[PDB]
């Protein structure tokens with residue numbers, strides 16, 4: 125950071141003040157500034173045509189707002205609060221895009237079932253009234269001191285009511301509303317989320333939106349007021365004057381820097397016209413929340429922080445918003461290596477959560493235990509959500525392991541009859557200074573798999589420096605794929621014959637032929653499982669919900685394969701290999 129401090133100093137052309145030291149230590153942290161990934165992110169094919177990240181057109185009438193976020197570091201320190209607060213943060217993120225958060229999909233990676241993590245997510249999810257539609261849960265001792273908590277949230281928003289994630293013109297104002305601001309953010313880095321407040325924050329924000337009051341928005345998370353306001357105006361090439369004496373407080377004797385940087389939970393930034401502001405506060409008050417007009421959007425691209433008439437801070441806004449950028453490494457993929465089988469156990473999400481009185485996937489077209497969460501929006505309209513990763517492969521080869529994870533997310537989406545629309549991604553990695561090439565290999569694999577598949581990146585998250593005594597975690601890119609599907613066309617499991625369709629090993633040049641085979645068979649109403657292990661206990665237990673028994677002879681499969689299980693009355697006719705292996709009956 126001494127390097128960064130020297131950059132800051134050159135840019136300001138003087139010693140930074142106490143407040144600038146605090147402000148930049150947040151904004152230029154890897155968590156906020158993305159110094160090691162920004163360049164890699166610029167090389168990702170992204171969803172242009174969408175005027176905000178995370179929001180993807182579905183049928184011209186509805187979009188889906190979705191994003192995945194990590195909460196690894198808090199969760200290692202306090203599993204329960206870390207996980208619960210993780211859920212609360214990603215809900216606010218989706219909300220800010222203008223969507224009623226309506227679906228949660230968890231991606232958990234741990235040495236063990238950490239009760240506090242499963243319970244923190246369950247309890248919070250139960251209290252906010254937002255359903256868990258699925259979970260990917262992987263168990264490996266390689267994760268013992270660094271559990272990964274990735275949470276994906278989604279919701280539907282009218283195309284005629286999208287919320288911008290920027291300020292738009294000088295003279296707009298910014299309202300901060302929701303929970304009051306305390307001294308929040310080792311145990312000092314843990315915050316206590318409360319779902320009851322966030323539940324009121326959802327209703328109040330959606331009410332504001334409906335009235336036409338929200339002209340832009342951003343959730344408060346890391347960095348608090350500073351992050352939200354600097355970024356709103358930085359994205360619109362504007363400035364802000366922030367009046368800290370106006371933030372509603374929970375502890376009155378806070379110093380201005382403490383108000384600026386507090387990471388108190390359940391807060392929202394709303395950009396509006398100054399004449400709409402008293403109605404916004406009217407609504408927040410009605411919903412038992414705290415609110416005030418806090419910043420003025422200005423034309424000069426300066427970030428000026430006030431406490432009453434006291435200048436707290438003034439810097440160029442684009443200095444805060446653009447952390448120093450670390451050079452990329454050019455990564456060159458060699459041949460696909462042979463993979464070993466590495467011990468990663470899968471846990472049934474529905475089984476694990478059921479113990480904390482928490483349902484998974486109840487309002488879905490088909491159970492997510494079969495591989496993808498399918499949601500009904502209208503009679504002939506819906507979407508799908510898939511969360512997938514292959515850290516067991518990325519361990520051995522980071523590029524190919526990562527690329528396959530993406531390709532397999534496509535298989536899963538096609539398997540329910542859905543067409544891939546977009547990816548949200550969570551990069552979970554160790555130390556990029558120690559190991560630059562691993563990060564490079566991940567980012568390039570994401571870049572090339574998006575290219576190979578035609579599926580763009582909509583949103584994402586990077587969590588770096590996941591280590592214990594310098595031992596890095598397995599490089600884990602969590603892929604969350606959005607797909608489009610007619611729920612009327614989704615196959616349910618039926619008494620049928622089972623076939624292994626494809627090849628027991630992997631060659632990139634035949635993946636698209638498998639996809640074409642899945643598509644064809646899906647169009648004809650076949651039920652299709654696509655899983656690394658081919659068939660799992662989760663599959664078996666899910667079939668029992670339908671009163672069905674599987675008796676199969678599974679083909680021997682490599683750690684990376686190009687096979688799926690197709691359930692149909694008669695033999696699949698496809699330009700891919702087909703072997704009859706058993707039955708599904710009763």
Ligand SMILES: [Cl-]
Pocket residue numbers: 125128129132148149152
């Ligand atoms: Cl710094």
